[PDB]
Every structure is written in structure tokens, then in C-alpha cells.
């Protein structure tokens, strides 16, 4: 394999962490090959569930704790921190909320969190890599409570970066935002790839096409599929109940991706760096709701 940059995965990874038996557990939690037989039935499906007051209940709060765990993940970035270290505190952070942290298991993933650094798009797998003064990194938090699973990512830098690095992190960021602004009863989930495009070209950056946003609630991953870019044929209008992702990755160079050996890191094929955001959204009669908002800040992370 031809690494398309200068990352390298760090191995061995620690042994696999358990998660107590008191933590309700998805379905996929215990498949040999991590398949969501949940999800498997759904495929094909593109109707989007309308939430009831107790679905959106149990989405507030998982969001809310989700939010909190990545904001635990946010105090830990600097130089010499490993990847690992950083989702051995997160795993700790979802048990002590009384959560499954999401992406364990799910396909066979083997870490609670993903944390992706410069080339990598998204996936990357907390390893024994120490962050390096000029990296970015991300980091992608899924919960899991009493049924519902809540997302969120965030883009923070490691130490001072340089101004690529900056203008890449703040323009993803603003397309997040712009999308999430146009998000109303009434809107096709095909529009909000449009905006997002238009504001990275803007800026000289691509925009990935191989990930999506996508519905979520009682399954990681169902209908809609939100795609990012412009032009795409995605099926569905927004209403008053639907909850989904929004989750753009924005590159400095060409909009390619390819996989590591390893079966679920993603990379610009070119070795230029990626940046994404990403919230959980419900659809509300006046716009949208931020489930996954910080409650005690203005800014994002990398803002201070
Ligand atoms: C075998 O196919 C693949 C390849 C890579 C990854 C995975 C599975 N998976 C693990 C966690 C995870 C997180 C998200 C997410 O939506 N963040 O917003 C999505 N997919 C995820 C499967
Ligand atoms: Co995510
Ligand atoms: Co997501
Ligand atoms: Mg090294
Ligand atoms: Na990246």
C-alpha cells in the first residue's frame, strides 16, 4: 500500500475496551461482523421517521451527553496527547453517562470514538500516534441512550497551525452552518449540498463525495442520505419531526478519497488535509433545532 501522505497508523492498538452489561447495547453491539439488523431491514426504505415528543425527548438527551463527551475530547488536544488516549477517556465518559458509545462495533470498528488528523477525511482509528504541534484533528462522537444514538464532530488544532490550516477548519465549519441555516419544513435534503459546495468552491476547496450526512434516532444510520456536494439526486423534503446529520468534509486539494488497508480510515487520495463538522438537526416549524449544541459557549472549539 502507497500511503497518500504522511500519516502512518500507529500499532498495536490497546486490546479491545469492554463496555458493563448494565449499558443497553444496540443491536450490532454483539453481531460477529458488527451488521445492524435493525439497519439491514430499513436498507432500500427512503421514508424518514416523523419523531413523537418521547422520541425527541430521548434524542435531546443522548445529543446533550454526546456533546458533552466530545467537549471532554476537546480539553485533551495538544501536542505529545495520543489518539488512544483520547478515546480511552471518551469510552469512560460514555459509561459514566450510562452509554454505549456507537461506533464500537459498529462493522466491526474497534474504537469508541474516531479521531482523524490532516489527510484523513474521516474514520481514522484512535491509535499510538502522539498529536503533532501543526496538526488538525477531528474528533466523532456517537451515543447511545435508552435507545437513540446522537452525533457530533468537531475539527480542533494542535497547537498553532498554519493559515491553510485555519482558513480550511473556519470555511468547513461556515459550510455547516450555511447548510444548517437553510433547514425548514418544506426544503429537499438535495439543496443543502448546494449551499455547501457553492461556499467551498468559493474558498479554492473540494468538497468529499463518498460520505454523507444521514438520518439518525433509533438506527446510527438511516433514511435520509444527506449528501454534501451539489447536484446530487438525494430523495426527500424536509418536515417537522425528521432528525438527521449534517456533516461536511471540505479538502485542500481534489475531492478523491480512498481506504487504508486497514478497511475504515479515509484519505485524500492526493495527501492534502481534510477538515469536518458535524450536528444532529431536528426539524422544527420555524427552522431547525441544534441538538448537539454547546449550551454553555457561543464558538466551536477551535474559535478559542
Ligand atoms: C465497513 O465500512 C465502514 C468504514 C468505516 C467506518 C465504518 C463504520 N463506522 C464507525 C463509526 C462510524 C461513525 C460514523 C459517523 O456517522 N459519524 O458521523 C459512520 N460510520 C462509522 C464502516
Ligand atoms: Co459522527
Ligand atoms: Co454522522
Ligand atoms: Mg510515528
Ligand atoms: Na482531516
Known sequence: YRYTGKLRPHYPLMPTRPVPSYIQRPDYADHPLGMSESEQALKGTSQIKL?????????????????????????????GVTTEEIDHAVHLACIARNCYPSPLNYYNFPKSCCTSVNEVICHGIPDRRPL???????????????????????????????????????????????????????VRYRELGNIIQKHAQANGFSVVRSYCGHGIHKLFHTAPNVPHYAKNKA?????SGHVFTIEPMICEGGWQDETWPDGW????????????????????????????????????????
Do not use: W
Not at 139 to 165: C, P, Q, W
Not at 235 to 239: F, L, P, Q, S
Not at 271 to 283: C, I, N
Open 235 to 239: 430523495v426527500g423534503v424536509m418536515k
Open 265 to 304: 480510515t479515509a484519505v485524500t487520495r492526493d495527501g492534502k488535509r481534510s477538515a469536518q463538522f458535524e450536528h444532529t438537526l431536528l426539524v422544527t416549524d420555524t427552522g431547525c433545532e441544534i441538538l448537539t449544541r454547546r449550551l454553555d459557549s457561543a464558538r466551536p472549539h477551535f474559535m478559542s
Open 132 to 186: 503533532q504541534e501543526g496538526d488538525i484533528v477531528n474528533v466523532d462522537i456517537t451515543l447511545y441512550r435508552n435507545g437513540y444514538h446522537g452525533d457530533l464532530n468537531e475539527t480542533f488544532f494542535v497547537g498553532e497551525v498554519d493559515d491553510g490550516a485555519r482558513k480550511l477548519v473556519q470555511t468547513t465549519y461556515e459550510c455547516l452552518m450555511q447548510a444548517i441555516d437553510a433547514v425548514k419544513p418544506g
Open 51 to 79: 419523531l413523537s415528543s418521547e422520541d425527541i425527548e430521548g434524542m435531546r438527551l443522548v445529543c446533550r451527553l454526546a456533546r458533552e463527551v466530545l467537549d471532554v475530547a476537546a480539553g485533551m488536544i495538544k501536542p
